[PDB]
């Protein structure tokens, strides 16, 4: 029943990473996390984000495959 | 290199998913997805979200493990 809408919703969220406002929000959240570290770790954390934010998102989307996610909660085979 | 700050940042993100503001943002994002559907499909989508969104959030929290993420992107050992 819910199998197809679950997969569409996971895909919707993952494609919405292309939206400008979503990109701004993700980068802001990453910068906020780095901001609570002391020097020199804050700067090192900012450098890490600048290099690895794309791969971080790519890996998260990879792991959150719609079929895997939606079968894990039991609405899809 | 970046291994130590990666784990600190992913720990932050893991706990940030548990904030009420973040939980509300994720729920609202899913509900916005449903809003693009015409009737009766929007209601079916809303029903799914109402029943299952906390289980979806749990899966996202589980993925956001510092050791897992930081080794998957290649900055930390396993």
Swiss-Prot record, chain A:
Phylogenetic lineage: Eukaryota, Metazoa, Chordata, Craniata, Vertebrata
Span of the entire protein shown here: 440 to 516 of 557
Transmembrane segments: none
Glycosylation sites: 20
Organism of provenance: Mus musculus
Coiled coil regions, renumbered to chain: none
Gene expressing this chain: Psap
The protein's name: Saposin-D
Annotated S-S bridges: 3-76, 6-70, 34-45
Lineage: superkingdom: Eukaryota
Domain Saposin B-type span(s) in chain numbering: 1-77
UniProtKB/Swiss-Prot annotation, chain B:
Domain Saposin B-type: 1-78
Source taxon at top rank: Eukaryota
Annotated glycosylation sites: 20
Disulfide bridges in this chain: 3-76, 6-70, 34-45
Protein name: Saposin-D
